[PDB]
Nucleic acid binder design. Structure first.
Length: 33
RNA sequence: GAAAGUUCACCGAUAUUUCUUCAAUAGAGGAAGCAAAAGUCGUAACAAGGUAGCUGUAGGUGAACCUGCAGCUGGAUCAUUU
C-alpha cells in the first residue's frame, strides 16, 4: 500500500478499459454514417 | 384641354426553382451512466493483505485483473570498506 482509498478498481486499469471502449465505438460509428 | 387604350424603362408584392445556412422531429437496431442493496461467480485492494504498491505504454484474459519494458516512494530502507 502506498496510496489512499481509491475505490473503483485500480485507476490505471480503469483508464485502459475506457480506451478499448472508445476505440470500439469509433470503429462502429465510422461505417454507420 | 382631356378619358379609355399602346409601347419602353424602373421600383417590386407573390409564386416557382437553385445554392447556402439554422432550428426542430419520427425511428428498426447498437452502446454507456447513475440510483436501488438479503441475487450470482470469484477475492483484486487496505497488515510485507499472504505475487510491496502505484504511474506511462503494448499484448493477453469470464471478471476483479495478469504479463513484458522504463520510472517514482505517496515503502517494508532517512544508516555501515576512512
Amino acid at each position: 500500500g502506498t496510496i489512499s482509498r481509491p475505490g473503483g478498481m485500480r485507476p490505471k486499469w480503469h483508464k485502459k478499459r475506457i480506451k478499448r471502449l472508445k476505440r470500439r465505438r469509433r470503429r462502429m460509428r465510422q461505417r454507420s454514417k
